[PDB]
Structure 1
Amino acid sequence: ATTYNAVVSKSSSDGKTFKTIADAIASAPAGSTPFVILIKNGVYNERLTITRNNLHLKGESRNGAVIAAATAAGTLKSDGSKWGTAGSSTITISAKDFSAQSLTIRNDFDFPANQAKSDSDSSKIKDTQAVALYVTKSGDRAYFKDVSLVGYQATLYVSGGRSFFSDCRISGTVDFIFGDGTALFNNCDLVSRYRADVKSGNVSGYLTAPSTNINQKYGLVITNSRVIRESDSVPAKSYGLGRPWHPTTTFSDGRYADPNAIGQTVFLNTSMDNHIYGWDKMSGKDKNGNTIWFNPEDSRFFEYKSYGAGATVSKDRRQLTDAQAAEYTQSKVLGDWTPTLP
């Protein structure tokens, strides 16, 4: 039994369908009864914010149903202010029990074209993060199955509660999965992208930048997945598995890198190509305005039974025991929530 509350399509010959996704979402009665929207094949140039609980999107196919918009953090609004990282997102989830299935979500900000611009070009953006998908502090129980997420810097922003990504593709360069949420990935392709702007010998990017609060049990957990290069031009040892993001945060004694954001990234049973060199450090500003470095050895960065050419075991790459690995099942990570589609 599968039935839709609204249908979106590019055709008028399709019949009684909405022309935009935003229109179909807005049409949902107020409340928290399930609302299921079918999205037919096409590229929908839209930015969406989801505030209704129990909303569900289903694309006709991952290959053909695309929601896309180009916005960087350094892109300017009408009032001349920057959008910022959170504000750059193509899709923002600020509701509970959201699901998306069989669709692609992109931030189309052309990072390589931006980097190729001359340094004196006033249109060259420095704040190059450009989020495809953002799950906010208000999001919990967000389920993404057979979804593709496309960007370069800062593709996926996972904050708030629990999110589950299954049979997914996520592509990016720098910190392309980041934030303080509980985010479980199973059977996903994590695609590290080529950077034309990076000198031979320098780092191209980092898969994760977790900012998990030290008192939160689970951050970014990646299971049964594949960590792959976009192309043969992505150099060996060009990508880190993670670096520790301590976000600038307003405290009673000022605004500075959160010392208690000691992020967790755990890889279990995951293949890795040789573009991976291991973990890395990251800097912030301290309470005095000085540069402070946060080291991977002080973070919750672990692996369990990685394989492929990028899976080396050393003192700089801590490994879980069998008993420790048993703490990272779906049941333990997601707790009482069983992700289900309508």
Structure 2
Amino acid sequence: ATTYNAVVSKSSSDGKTFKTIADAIASAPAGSTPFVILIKNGVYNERLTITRNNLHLKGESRNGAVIAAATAAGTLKSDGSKWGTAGSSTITISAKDFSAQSLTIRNDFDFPANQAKSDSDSSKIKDTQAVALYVTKSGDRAYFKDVSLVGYQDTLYVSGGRSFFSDCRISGTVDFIFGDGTALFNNCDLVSRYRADVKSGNVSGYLTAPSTNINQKYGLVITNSRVIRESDSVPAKSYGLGRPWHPTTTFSDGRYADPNAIGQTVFLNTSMDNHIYGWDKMSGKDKNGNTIWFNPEDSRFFEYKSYGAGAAVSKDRRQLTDAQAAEYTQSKVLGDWTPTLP
């Protein structure tokens, strides 16, 4: 008995349906009773910030139901300032118990066309992060089933609490899954994209850039998934599994890369194609303004039974024991939260 409180569609003939997702959401009664919105197939050019708890979106299909907007961190607002990384997000989850199913969320920033522009072209953006989905610190218990997240740089920004991605497709280039949140991905396609602007022997990107605080037990946890390249032109050994992101943070002794943001990315029972070369390091600025490198061997980067040509042949890729692997069940990672659809 699945009941939709509202229906969004492109038809002005579909009946008492909404034209945009924002309107359908705004029709929700104040409070925290569950509210479910069916989004009929179509491309909805909208940027949404979810502040209503217990809101649930269901698209007619992951392939046909799309929420898309083109915004880069470097994209300028009316006042001439930049949107920023968080601000470029097509969808921002700032409420609890959100769920999206069978739909696609895209940031349509044309990263390749931007990279192809001449350097003297004043419209060529440097701050090229363009987030498709951002789960903020106010978005605990965000659930995404049969959802597709599309972007290049910084596709998925997960911060704060717990989020679960099941049977999803996430595509990107650089740090396309990043943040400090507890994000569990099960049975997902993590799609590494082609970079026309990167020479074949250089790094095209990194699947993850966790910023997990050292005291947080779980960061980015990918299980029973597939790490694949979007095309045969993605070179062998062009993608890192992860890179340690230590966010510039304000401390009583200055603003610089957080030394305690010792990120975690763990893969279990996940296939990896040949584009993966292993983990990588990342640089930031320390308390003195010097360049500092945060190394993978100093981060919580682990694998358990990866397979495929991209899996570990060498030993500089730490492996979990069977006992340690048992600590990465959905129950343990998500704790008191059991993700369920309306």
Residue 121 (structure 1) aligned with residue 121 (structure 2)? yes
For residue 253 of structure 1, report the CA deviation from its aligned partner.
Answer: 1.4
Higher deviation after alignment, 36-45 or 306-315: 306-315
Q: Distance in 1 between matches of 2:323 and 2:313?
A: 18
Q: Distance in 1 between matches of 2:103 and 2:130?
A: 19
Q: Distance in 1 between matches of 2:338 and 2:98?
A: 13
Aligned pair count reads: 342
Q: Which residue of 2 aligns with 1:180?
A: 180
Q: Distance in 2 between matches of 1:171 and 1:200?
A: 20
Q: Distance in 1 between matches of 2:83 and 2:316?
A: 37
For residue 176 of structure 1, report the CA deviation from its aligned partner.
Answer: 0.2
Q: Look up the SS of the partner of 1:259 in the other structure.
A: coil
For residue 46 of structure 1, report the CA deviation from its aligned partner.
Answer: 0.2
Q: Which residue of 2 aligns with 1:282?
A: 282
Q: Percent identity?
A: 99
Q: Look up the SS of the partner of 1:137 in the other structure.
A: coil
Q: Distance in 2 between matches of 1:222 and 1:17?
A: 37
Q: Look up the SS of the partner of 1:185 in the other structure.
A: strand
For residue 26 of structure 1, report the CA deviation from its aligned partner.
Answer: 1.1
For residue 199 of structure 1, report the CA deviation from its aligned partner.
Answer: 1.2
Length-normalised TM-score, structure 1: 0.99
For residue 314 of structure 1, report the CA deviation from its aligned partner.
Answer: 2.5
Q: Distance in 2 between matches of 1:316 and 1:14?
A: 57
Unpaired runs of at least 5, structure 1: none
Residue 306 (structure 1) aligned with residue 311 (structure 2)? no
Residue 209 (structure 1) aligned with residue 195 (structure 2)? no
Q: Distance in 2 between matches of 1:262 and 1:316?
A: 18
Q: Look up the SS of the partner of 1:184 in the other structure.
A: strand
For residue 313 of structure 1, report the CA deviation from its aligned partner.
Answer: 3.7
Q: What does the per-residue CA deviation read over 1:243-290, in whole Å, with 9 as the maximum and x for residues that have no partner?
A: 000000111111100000000000000000000000000000111111
Q: Distance in 1 between matches of 2:309 and 2:48?
A: 39
For residue 200 of structure 1, report the CA deviation from its aligned partner.
Answer: 2.3
Q: Distance in 1 between matches of 2:129 and 2:173?
A: 10
Q: What does the per-residue CA deviation read over 1:49-71, in whole Å, with 9 as the maximum and x for residues that have no partner?
A: 00010000000000100000000
Higher deviation after alignment, 226-235 or 309-318: 309-318
Q: Look up the SS of the partner of 1:297 in the other structure.
A: helix
Q: Look up the SS of the partner of 2:325 in the other structure.
A: helix
Q: Distance in 1 between matches of 2:168 and 2:69?
A: 20
Q: Look up the SS of the partner of 1:245 in the other structure.
A: coil
Q: What does the per-residue CA deviation read over 1:157-204, in whole Å, with 9 as the maximum and x for residues that have no partner?
A: 000100000000000000000000000000000000000000121110
Q: Distance in 1 between matches of 2:136 and 2:313?
A: 35
Length-normalised TM-score, structure 2: 0.99
Q: Look up the SS of the partner of 2:71 in the other structure.
A: coil
For residue 27 of structure 1, report the CA deviation from its aligned partner.
Answer: 1.3
For residue 315 of structure 1, report the CA deviation from its aligned partner.
Answer: 2.5
Q: What does the per-residue CA deviation read over 1:7-48, in whole Å, with 9 as the maximum and x for residues that have no partner?
A: 101001100011000011111111000000010000000000
Q: What does the per-residue CA deviation read over 1:104-142, in whole Å, with 9 as the maximum and x for residues that have no partner?
A: 000000000000000111000000000000000111010
Q: Distance in 2 between matches of 1:195 and 1:226?
A: 20
Q: Distance in 2 between matches of 1:91 and 1:105?
A: 7
Runs of 4+ in 1 over 3 A off after TM superposition: none
Q: Distance in 2 between matches of 1:24 and 1:325?
A: 42
Q: What does the per-residue CA deviation read over 1:90-115, in whole Å, with 9 as the maximum and x for residues that have no partner?
A: 00000000000000000000000000
